[PDB]
């Protein structure tokens, strides 16, 4: 469950947050496959509650009604068509599995669901599954509100309602079977793995029992014996009873300390600076690299809806974001997930964004198609960070240097740092308020390399900055603290 099951080479997955299945299918064929992306995190594919107050917020998809593959992203056939077309071009699909709970206990009963299934939170009836009052933790939860009240009590965190979401009795074989039935349907369809939503709220052992029910990946696309990739969403920072290491027996875990600390370092908060990143990784209290799913921001915290808080960097801080994603894609630590979002009417007051609920670009509730502009950027308000040159090229950079060790580190004791990956790649950063001009050991073979941040290698020539590596591997780099992108990256495949 620790291997992402990507084709040989592919080292990253992209979160196409709220994209429709038909759009992801096309993206697999037109961009993801040729650019070297490993897979796609799709939003929950199961039927959810249609919430109109506020109007169709993104979070309504973490409020399950049934396991029918029927949502604003598409129906069961469109989903299947997506997995098939993506697998055929070597791009995997990872499902965001919302299995800890059903919808909010106070949501009104009826057919206000993405597939019209009837459900009654109050009587705890979800006939489309079916689930009844016997399948929820009402009796088990010991808090006065029935909701989670204190995170210092690991039991309550697992047995009570996360912000009121009806909590499934995951210890019951009936519930484990219903969930495995849903996950096996997706696996047999071609899905390569899952994001286990709210894993902190599930007992490591209940997750284990459910995983024991899962099949091996579809043998038409995957090697025999392939176990689905599993990454547990567990927000574990400082002091609290639950540790993400408690889930290592089930697969990887989201390392929320990663984006949080990379954000404070890049923002230079509390005296932090890039020179400190020399021991980036476990040295920072992070989980072991082979158990980490890393990212700069995720759909939640990019809205201030999660771990990391204010330090989290997003597409809104484009300049620094590209830098952060660049360091992440160049560093060997963990398995990288690139965020891809949509622009929303972010409006702050008294410090909080009152529009952080806004769902994806839509027309009367119907999610808008992703349109590709002539310059390869997206329209319809989709940000498509994965299409940004500096990010897509670092995605390729990661593939090129895969397996190569972290080496040849340099820092000026402040914010000008650089490092290489074996003799396959080299990257340099300048985040100080002054220019950086110096000759560094790159560990790369002599020659002329195209800097993939400022440009591309095309038709045997460079469109941007060019770096010359001498016979001893040394090369001169010059970065103005005013440069559009204050960092340079060169690798074996951008060599002329
Ligand atoms: C949110 C995080 O809280 C901790 O930090 C956990 O440790 C962590 O695991 C979790 N993050 C994961 C899990 C959930 C939960 O479903 C998702 O939260 C996402 O989906 C939730 C459910 O729709 C959202 O809740 C929001 O919507 C719910 C209903 O739609 C509301 O229920 C409330 O109103 C409903 C009616 O309107 C009622 O029926 C319900 O009983 C009542 O509790 C919550 O009060 C509200 O905050 C949440 O705002 C969003 O971020 C995240 O995307 C996912 O990353
Ligand atoms: C790269 O471009 C230059 C012109 O900018 C041209 O002279 C050169 O021959 C090109 N290289 C190749 C390999 O086509
Ligand atoms: O999986 N990211 O929360
Ligand atoms: Ca639970």
Curated annotation (Swiss-Prot):
SUPFAM superfamilies: (Trans)glycosidases (SSF51445), Glycosyl hydrolase domain (SSF51011). InterPro entries: A-amylase/branching_C, A-amylase_C, Alpha_amylase, Glyco_hydro_13_cat_dom, Glyco_hydro_b, Glycoside_hydrolase_SF. Belongs to the glycosyl hydrolase 13 family. Its cofactor is Ca(2+); chloride. Pfam families: Alpha-amylase, Alpha-amylase_C. It is found in: Secreted, Extracellular space. Coiled coil: none annotated. Glycans are attached at residue 461. Disulfide bonds join 28-86, 70-115, 141-160, 378-384, 450-462. The keyword Metal-binding applies. This is Pancreatic alpha-amylase. It catalyses: Endohydrolysis of (1->4)-alpha-D-glucosidic linkages in polysaccharides containing three or more (1->4)-alpha-linked D-glucose units. Ca(2+) binds at residues 100, 158, 167, 201. It comes from Homo sapiens (Human). Binds 1 Ca(2+) ion per subunit. Keywords: Calcium, Carbohydrate metabolism, Chloride, Disulfide bond, Glycoprotein, Glycosidase, Hydrolase, Metal-binding, Pyrrolidone carboxylic acid, Secreted, Signal. Chloride binds at residues 195, 298, 337. Its main location: secreted.
